[PDB]
Enzyme design. Structure first.
Site, PDB file in Angstrom:
ATOM      1  N   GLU D  16       0.819  -1.207   0.000  1.00 38.11           N
ATOM      2  CA  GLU D  16       0.000   0.000   0.000  1.00 38.11           C
ATOM      3  C   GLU D  16       0.855   1.259   0.000  1.00 38.11           C
ATOM      4  O   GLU D  16       0.480   2.265  -0.613  1.00 38.11           O
ATOM      5  CB  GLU D  16      -0.957   0.003   1.196  1.00 38.11           C
ATOM      6  CG  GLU D  16      -1.821  -1.240   1.337  1.00 38.11           C
ATOM      7  CD  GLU D  16      -2.730  -1.490   0.147  1.00 38.11           C
ATOM      8  OE1 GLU D  16      -3.126  -0.519  -0.535  1.00 38.11           O
ATOM      9  OE2 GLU D  16      -3.047  -2.669  -0.110  1.00 38.11           O
ATOM     10  N   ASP D  96      -4.871  -5.239  -9.193  1.00 39.14           N
ATOM     11  CA  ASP D  96      -4.066  -4.182  -9.802  1.00 39.14           C
ATOM     12  C   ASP D  96      -3.365  -4.675 -11.061  1.00 39.14           C
ATOM     13  O   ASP D  96      -3.272  -3.944 -12.055  1.00 39.14           O
ATOM     14  CB  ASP D  96      -3.050  -3.661  -8.791  1.00 39.14           C
ATOM     15  CG  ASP D  96      -3.691  -2.857  -7.686  1.00 39.14           C
ATOM     16  OD1 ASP D  96      -4.051  -1.691  -7.942  1.00 39.14           O
ATOM     17  OD2 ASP D  96      -3.842  -3.392  -6.568  1.00 39.14           O
TER      18      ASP D  96
END
Lengths: 101, 74, 40, 154, 33, 69, 89, 200, 118
Positions: D16, D96
Site C-alpha cells: 500500500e 491491480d
C-alpha cells in the site's frame, strides 16, 4: 464555444506543421512562429499561398542534400539517416521554404 | 475521410524527445529515433476504428472477391 | 516530470523505432495444402 | 499487529505504501483518500482515491495518462519485490495486475496505440445492463495477430 | 479464337476484351447519395 | 480461546507456533505451501488404503477428495 | 464440454476452420495502411494551408475540452474560410 | 452451373477485381446445392450415403445447418464440396467462354431494353451462333493443379537499390521494409509513418 | 517445496540465486532485506537502496539530468525483438527459461522447435 485572439492563436500554433520543426533551434522556432503569426494576423483576408508551379511543383518547399532528385517524394528527411562523419553527403543540408503573397 | 483528422494531428505535433533528452549512438538525430516520438494525443477514437474495421470486414466477408471457397463453411 | 505542462520553447522574457516486424509461422505441408485448396 | 502477523503486516504495508507513493508522484492522478493496512484487525489493505466529478469523466484518454495509471497499478507488486524480495511476493496484487493488463490491452487493441498491430479495432468495451459493471466485446484474432499484439502488450 | 483453354485460376482470369472501361468518381459523397 | 476469526488466513505468515500436531518454526509458510499442504489430508485416505492393502484396496470411500485435489 | 476441433499445434495454433483469417487480416491492415499513407501524402503538401485554416479557425471559436456537458457538417463562416483557403491558382 | 454463371460472366467481362457482391447469394446457393449433395443426399464418392447435417436453426453467428462429425470426415466432405464447386465454376466459365459473342450480344440487348422476354433471348442467342451443352453434368470439368481449366479440349471423356532510394535506412539488410520493383517501399510506406509494415 | 514446484523450477531458481550471489552488492542487499523481512532485534531498519545508489538517485532529482521519467513507456522498453515467435512462451520467458522449461508444455512436436535448437 470559446474563441481566442489571433496573437494567442498563432502562439498556440507555434511553428505549425513544419516538416523540420523538430530539428530546429528554439530561437529559430520562436522567430518563425512570430513572423508567420504576424503575417497570418496582420495580412488576413489577403494572404494567399504562392503559386505552386513556381516553387512547390519543383519540390523546393523541402529540399534535402542526400535526395536532390526527390526520389523519396519529399520524405527523405525521415527516410534517410544523417550522414556519418567524412562519409559522402556529410554535412547534410536541409532547406524548408514558405512563400506567401 | 475517416483518418484525415488523425493524420493532421500527427503532422502538427511537437516531438518532445529532442526537447527532453540532453547530452555509442549519440547525437539528437539517431538518439531521438531509438523509440516512439512523444506525440501528445496519439491513439485513435475507437469509433473511426469501428467504422474502418466494419467497412473492411464487410468487404472481405460479403463479396468473396478472390477466395470463393470460403463460402463453403458459411 | 510531467511533460505537456511546462517548458520547451525559447522566450525573450542506431536502431529506428519504425522497425518492420515478422512472425515465424512454420506451417506443415498438409496445412499448406488445405490453405491452397481454400485459397481460391 | 496484535492479531496480524508481523510479516503479513510488513507485506501489506510495503504494498500500500508503494501504491500510494506512486499515485502521489504520478501527475494528474486522483488524490489519495485513505491508506488502510488491516484497519480493524481485518485481513485487508487498500488505498482509496477521491471520486471527482470534474476533469476527465469521459472526454479523452491520453496515452500518458493510461501509462501512468498502469504504472500506479504495477507499483504495489514492484514495491513488494524491491523491498521484500522476489520470493516474498504474494497474490494480493492481482486486481491491480488485472487493471494494468486491461489498460495495456485496451491501448494496443482498442485505441490503436501500437505501431505493429496498427489502428485495428479488435477489442471494445460495453456496459452491463453483482459482478463487474462492464464487459468486453472481443474479435477472434488469428495466431499471428494475437502474437504481435501480445508482444506489444508484454 | 480459343481464348479459353488458357484461363488460369492461379495467374488471373481475363477475357479477350482489355478491361471494360474507366471509373468516374466525382467525389465520395456524390458516389454515396 | 480468544483468536482472530481469520486465524486460518493468519496461519501462513505466523511463525514459531503449533497447531494440533504440526509445528511451524521461524520460516513462515507461503500461500503456495499453505494451500498445497491441504492436498496431503485429502490424499491420505487413498494413501492409507494403497499402503495397507494395495491397488485393489482402493475404494469409493476415498474417491471424493481426489477430485478436489 | 471440451473443444474437439484441434487442427494445428506444431508451427502455429490453429483450430479446424480458421482459414479465412490470415487473408482477412492481411487485407484489413494493408488497406488501412494504404489509406493512411495516402492521407499522409496528401496532407504533407498542404501544411501551409493546414496552419492557415487552423489560425483562422481558432479566432472563430471552438468547443474547449473543459468537460462542461451533461462536427460532421461544418458551419457557414467556417466553410467560407476553408473554401477561400482552398482557392489555389 | 447456372448459379455460378453470373459471377463467372462478370469476372470474365469486368475483370477479377471489379466483381461486385451481387453474386454472393447465388454463390451461396451453389454452395448449398453442393453441400446438400455431399452431406445430405449422399452423392459424395468418398463421403458416401450417410446423414451428416442436422438442422439446428431452431428459429450469434447464425448457423443454420450444424454438424457433429469428426474433423477428418469434415475435411473430406468439405473437400468434396470444394471440388464440386470447382467443377461447376469450370463448366460455367467454359460455357461463357465458348459463347462469348452471344454473351456480349445478350449483354448489349439487356442494356438497351432493360427487360427482355424468353423468345427475344432465344432469338438473340440463336442469331449469334450459340453452342449448347451436350450434357447437364459437370463430370470431367474442374481446375488443374497448375491452374488451367479442365475439359478445355485438352482432355476428353532484387528490388532497385539505386542512389537516394538506397541511401535510406538499412537497405540491403534483413531489417529493411519491403520494397516494390522501382525501389519504393511497399504501399508507398515511409519511415515517419505511425505504423510498422511486415517484412516479406 | 522443491518437489511441489518441480526440479526445472528449482534449477532455474538456483541459477537466479547463483547469479545474485556472484554480485557482492546484490548479495548484501538481499541479506539486508531478508533481515528486515524476518524482523527481530537484528533488523537493520529498512533495506538499502534498490540497486540505485546515492549517485544514481542524485543523478536525477528535479535538479540535474532529469526528464527521462517524462518520456513515454515505450522509451522504457528494455526488450525488443523484430521477429515475434509463433508461441507465447518464447515471448514471455527468456531463452534460458524456455530451454529449462517447455518439457512441461502440452504440445506435440513444437517443443523441439522452440529455442536452443539442437
Amino acid at each position: 464555444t470559446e474563441s481566442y485572439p489571433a496573437a494567442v492563436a498563432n502562439d498556440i500554433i507555434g511553428m505549425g506543421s513544419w516538416r523540420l520543426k523538430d530539428d530546429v533551434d528554439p530561437v529559430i522556432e520562436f522567430l518563425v512562429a512570430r513572423l508567420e503569426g504576424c503575417w497570418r494576423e496582420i495580412l488576413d483576408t489577403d494572404l494567399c499561398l504562392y503559386p505552386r508551379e513556381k516553387w512547390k511543383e519543383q519540390g523546393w518547399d523541402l529540399v534535402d542534400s542526400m535526395d536532390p532528385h526527390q526520389e523519396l517524394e519529399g520524405f527523405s528527411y525521415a527516410d534517410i539517416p544523417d550522414p556519418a562523419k567524412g562519409e559522402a553527403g556529410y554535412p547534410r543540408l536541409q532547406l524548408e521554404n514558405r512563400v506567401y503573397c | 475521410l475517416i483518418f484525415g483528422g488523425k493524420i493532421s494531428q500527427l503532422l502538427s505535433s511537437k516531438n518532445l524527445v529532442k526537447s527532453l533528452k540532453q547530452a555509442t549512438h549519440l547525437l539528437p538525430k539517431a538518439l531521438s529515433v531509438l523509440a516512439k516520438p512523444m506525440i501528445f494525443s496519439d491513439g485513435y477514437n475507437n469509433q473511426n476504428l469501428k467504422t474502418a474495421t466494419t467497412l473492411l470486414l464487410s468487404f472481405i466477408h460479403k463479396r468473396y472477391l478472390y477466395r470463393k471457397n470460403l463460402i463453403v463453411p458459411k | 516530470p510531467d511533460p505537456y505542462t511546462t517548458g520547451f520553447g525559447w522566450d525573450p522574457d542506431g536502431w529506428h523505432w519504425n522497425m518492420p516486424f515478422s512472425v515465424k509461422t512454420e506451417l506443415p505441408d498438409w496445412y499448406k495444402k488445405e490453405v491452397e485448396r481454400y485459397s481460391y | 499487529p496484535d492479531p496480524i502477523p508481523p510479516q503479513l503486516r510488513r507485506a501489506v504495508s510495503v504494498y500500500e505504501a508503494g501504491k500510494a507513493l506512486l499515485a502521489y508522484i504520478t501527475p494528474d492522478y486522483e488524490e489519495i483518500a485513505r491508506v488502510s493496512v488491516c484497519p480493524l484487525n481485518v485481513l485487508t489493505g487498500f488505498t482509496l482515491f477521491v471520486e471527482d466529478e470534474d476533469k476527465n469523466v469521459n472526454a479523452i484518454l491520453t496515452r500518458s495518462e493510461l501509462e501512468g495509471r498502469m504504472v500506479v497499478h504495477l507499483a504495489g507488486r514492484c514495491a513488494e519485490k524491491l523491498v521484500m524480495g522476489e520470493g516474498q511476493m504474494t497474490g494480493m496484487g492481482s486486481p491491480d495486475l488485472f487493471h494494468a493488463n486491461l489498460i495495456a490491452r485496451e491501448m494496443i487493441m482498442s485505441m490503436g496505440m501500437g505501431r505493429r498491430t496498427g489502428p485495428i479495432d479488435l477489442l471494445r468495451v460495453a456496459a452491463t445492463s453483482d459482478g463487474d459493471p462492464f464487459y468486453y466485446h472481443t474479435t477472434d484474432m488469428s495466431t499471428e495477430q494475437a502474437r504481435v499484439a501480445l508482444a506489444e502488450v508484454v | 479464337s480459343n481464348w479459353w483453354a488458357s484461363i488460369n485460376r492461379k495467374t488471373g482470369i481475363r477475357g479477350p476484351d482489355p478491361a471494360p472501361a474507366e471509373e468516374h468518381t466525382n467525389g465520395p459523397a456524390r458516389d454515396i447519395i | 480461546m480468544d483468536m482472530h476469526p481469520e486465524e486460518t488466513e493468519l496461519m501462513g505468515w505466523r511463525t514459531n507456533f503449533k497447531t494440533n500436531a504440526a509445528v511451524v518454526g521461524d520460516e513462515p509458510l507461503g500461500e503456495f505451501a499453505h494451500v498445497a499442504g491441504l492436498l496431503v489430508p485429502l490424499y491420505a485416505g487413498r494413501a492409507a488404503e494403497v499402503a495397507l492393502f494395495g491397488k485393489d484396496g482402493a475404494s469409493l470411500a476415498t474417491a471424493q477428495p481426489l477430485a478436489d485435489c | 464440454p471440451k473443444r474437439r476441433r484441434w487442427l494445428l499445434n506444431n508451427g502455429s495454433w490453429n483450430f479446424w476452420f480458421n482459414f479465412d483469417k490470415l487473408y482477412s487480416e492481411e487485407i484489413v491492415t494493408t488497406w488501412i495502411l494504404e489509406s493512411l499513407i495516402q492521407t499522409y501524402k496528401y496532407l504533407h503538401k498542404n501544411t501551409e494551408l493546414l496552419d492557415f485554416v487552423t489560425n483562422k479557425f481558432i479566432t472563430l471559436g471552438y468547443i474547449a475540452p473543459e468537460n462542461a456537458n451533461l462536427q460532421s457538417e461544418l458551419l457557414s463562416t467556417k466553410e467560407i474560410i476553408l473554401t477561400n483557403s482552398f482557392k489555389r491558382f | 452451373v447456372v448459379h455460378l454463371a453470373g459471377r463467372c460472366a462478370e469476372k470474365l467481362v469486368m475483370g477479377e477485381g471489379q466483381m461486385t457482391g451481387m453474386g454472393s447469394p447465388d454463390l451461396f446457393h451453389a454452395n448449398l446445392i453442393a453441400r446438400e449433395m455431399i452431406m445430405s443426399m449422399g452423392m459424395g464418392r468418398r463421403t458416401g450415403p450417410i446423414d451428416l447435417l442436422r438442422v439446428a436453426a431452431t428459429s450469434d453467428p447464425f448457423y443454420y445447418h450444424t454438424t457433429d462429425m469428426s474433423t477428418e470426415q469434415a475435411r473430406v466432405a468439405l473437400a468434396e464440396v470444394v471440388e464440386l464447386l470447382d467443377a461447376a465454376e469450370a463448366k460455367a466459365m467454359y460455357g461463357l467462354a465458348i459463347n462469348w459473342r452471344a454473351l456480349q450480344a445478350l449483354t448489349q440487348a439487356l442494356l438497351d431494353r432493360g427487360t427482355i422476354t424468353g423468345k427475344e433471348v432465344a432469338h438473340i442467342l440463336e442469331s449469334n451462333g450459340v453452342i449448347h451443352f451436350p450434357d447437364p453434368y459437370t463430370t470431367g470439368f474442374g481446375w488443374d493443379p497448375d491452374g488451367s481449366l479442365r475439359y478445355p479440349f485438352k482432355p476428353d471423356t532484387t528490388p532497385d537499390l539505386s542512389g537516394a532510394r538506397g541511401k535510406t535506412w538499412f537497405a540491403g539488410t534483413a531489417y529493411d521494409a519491403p520494397r516494390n520493383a522501382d525501389g519504393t517501399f511497399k504501399h508507398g510506406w515511409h519511415w515517419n509513418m505511425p505504423f510498422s509494415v511486415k517484412t516479406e | 517445496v522443491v518437489d511441489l514446484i518441480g526440479r526445472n523450477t528449482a534449477v532455474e531458481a538456483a541459477e537466479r540465486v547463483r547469479d545474485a550471489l556472484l554480485h557482492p552488492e546484490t548479495r548484501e542487499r538481499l541479506l539486508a532485506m531478508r533481515r528486515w523481512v524476518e524482523g527481530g532485534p537484528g533488523a537493520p531498519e529498512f533495506p538499502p537502496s534498490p540497486l540505485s545508489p546515492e549517485q544514481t538517485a542524485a543523478m536525477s532529482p528535479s535538479g540535474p539530468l532529469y526528464g527521462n521519467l517524462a518520456l513515454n513507456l515505450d522509451w522504457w522498453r528494455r526488450r525488443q525483438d523484430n521477429v515475434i515467435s509463433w508461441s507465447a512462451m518464447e515471448i514471455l520467458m527468456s531463452r534460458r527459461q524456455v530451454d529449462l522449461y517447455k518439457q512441461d508444455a502440452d504440445m506435440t512436436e513444437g517443443a523441439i522447435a522452440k529455442l536452443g535448437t539442437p
